[PDB]
Each structure stands twice: as C-alpha cells, then as structure tokens.
Amino acid sequence: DIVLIQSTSSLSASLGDRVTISCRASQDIRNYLNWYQQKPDGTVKLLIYYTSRLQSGVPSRFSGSGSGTDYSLTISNLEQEDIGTYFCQQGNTLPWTFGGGTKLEIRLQQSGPELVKPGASVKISCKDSGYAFSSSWMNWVKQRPGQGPEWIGRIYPGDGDTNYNGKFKGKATLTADKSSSTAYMQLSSLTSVDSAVYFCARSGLLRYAMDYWGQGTSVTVS
C-alpha cells in the first residue's frame, strides 16, 4: 500500500501569511493527489484534486503543486476561515490512502452518534439527496483523533458492486438502498480501536476524488 507523509503535523501562522504544506508519497502517484480541508467542527470538503485543480467555489489563494512523490498545498495569504486540518490523499492505487494531516492554527446526511458495548456491532446510514446516488460510488472513511484517515471501501448502489480495503474486509459490510437513496455501513465486533468518526463520501466523475461528504457519525465503544 502507498504511504503518504505530511512532515509537519501542526503549524501556527499569522493572518495574511503564505502557508505551504507538504505531502510525500512512498512511490510515484502520477499526480493523482487530492487535498481535503476539515474545519474545526469536523466538516470535510475537497479543495484540490489531481494535484492542482481547484474545486468550484474554492478561493484562488489556494493552489496545489507537485509531481512524482512530492506534493504541496499553498495558501497565498491565510484567512480565518482557512483554519482547520488539511489531509492529502492519493488515488493512484487502491486502497486509497491519506497523509497524517496538518493542523493549521492562528498564532449527505449521516445518522446520529452511537455508544456501543465492546464486541457489539453497529449499522450506520448515509442518505444522498443528490440525483446521482445510484450512478456514483459511496466511499466510507474512518477517522481516529489525530490519526491519518483510512479509506474503508466503497459501494456502487447502481448494481451493488463493492471494493474493500483489505484491512477492513472482516470489519465493514457495505450495502445500499436505491429506493431511499441511502447507503449503509455495518461494523462488526467492535473494539476500542473502532471508536472513531466514520464518514461517507461520494465520488463519481473522478472515482478517486471524494467530492461530497457527510458530516460524519461518531461511534464510541464503552
């Protein structure tokens, strides 16, 4: 599996400062590198895809560069709304993998939180109001505090096709219901390591770029 490293895990700067965050891959990822921004409230948005393309709506102060194994994201002049944690993600080879994240500071409808007993199981949902639910891939991502997110797998509701990250094949079961435009993920035999926030994130135009995100579901093992 490809490993992504963000050598700076935390950085503080001043408003107006130029900021540049690095992402290094263990092997050539052929520019299939995306950047996500997670606000302090936990919401996630795709900011840059395919190394340098800005998602619609993203301010021009954001830019991405790189090639081979070395990539970077730059904010030309920092604004308050840019505070949060940035994660790079490669889309060259499955399973998709993310960097550990870089927290920056100033110097889809998912189901509710669940509290589970050790060894129990949970089944969380993600409803898509978009018309392309049945013709898009619904991905699921795990995020533990301060850890690099992990891509769990994906399902194509159109025909039920699934792809799992080997690490989660015995842990997660993905299903979907086209009639209600809802995707589900069942997590089995939960351990303390399974306590995390789980996100559903859709991809379609670019399979390796998740352009629509749910707000996340916090699963806690007691």
| Domain 1-107: assigned CATH number | 2.60.40.10
- Which residues fall within 8 angstroms of residue 159, CB to CB, at 6 or more apart? none
Phi, psi values for residue 70, rounded to 5°: -110, 125
Judge whether 34 and 151 are in contact, CB under 8 Å: no
What kind and span of H or E run contains 110? Answer: strand 109-110
What gap in Å lies between CA 14 and CA 108, rounded to an integer?
Answer: 34
At which residue do the structure tokens 């400062």 appear?
17
Q: What would the two tokens of residue 128 be?
A: 């898509």
Cα separation, 212 vs 181, in Å, equals 14
Q: How far apart are alpha carbons 163 and 73 in whole angstroms?
A: 29
3-class secondary structure, 168:
helix
Rounded to 5 degrees, what are φ and ψ at 37? -115, 130
Q: What is the number of alpha carbons within 13 Å of residue 81 lying toward its C-beta?
A: 5
With vertex at residue 45, the alpha carbon angle to CA 41 and CA 51, rounded to the nearest 5 degrees, is: 140
Cβ atoms < 10 Å from Cβ of 203? 19
Structure-block tokens of residue 67: 């090639």
Domain with CATH 2.60.40.10 in the chain: 1-107, 108-213
Distance, CA of 175 to CA of 4 (rounded, Å): 29
The residue type found at 102 is: T
- Is the Cβ–Cβ distance between 127 and 109 less than 8 Å? yes
Buried b (16+ CB within 10 A) or exposed e, 52-79: eebbeebeeebebebeebebbbebeebe
Give the count of beta carbons closer than 10 Å to the beta carbon of residue 115.
12
What token pair was written down for 78? 């920092």
Token digits of residue 113: 């939180």
Are residues 6 and 19 in contact, defined by beta-carbon separation less than 8 angstroms?
no
Q: Are 23 and 74 in contact (CB under 8 A)?
A: no
Quote the tokens at residue 25: 């891959």
Looking at the chain, how many residues does it have? 222
* Triad 138, 142, 143: Cα angle to 5°: 135
Residue 47 and residue 90: Cα distance in Å, rounded? 14
Q: What does the block give as tokens for 50?
A: 């395919």
Return the amino acid letter for 222: S
Q: Are 110 and 124 in contact (CB under 8 A)?
A: yes
Resolution of the experimental model in angstroms, please? 1.3
CA distance 186 to 197: 14
Quick check: 34 and 46 in contact, CB under 8 A? yes
Q: How far apart are CA 195 and CA 153, in angstroms?
A: 18
- The method recorded for this entry reads X-ray
Please answer whether residues 28 and 70 qualify as being in contact, where contact means their C-beta atoms are separated by less than 8 angstroms: no
CA-angle at 179, arms to 175 and 184, nearest 5°: 25
Number of H helices, E strands in the chain: 0, 22
Query: How would you label 164-193 residue by residue, b for 16+ Cβ within 10 Å and e otherwise?
Result: bbeebeebbbbebeeeebbbbbebeebeee
* Side chain identity at residue 109, one-letter code: Q
Burial of 112 (0-12, 13-18, 19+ CB in 10 A): exposed
Q: Determine whether 157 is exposed, middle or buried from the number of CB atoms within 10 Å of its CB (0-12, 13-18, 19+).
A: buried
Q: Which CATH number fits domain 108-213: 3.40.50.2300, 2.60.40.10, 2.30.30.30, 1.10.3720.10?
A: 2.60.40.10
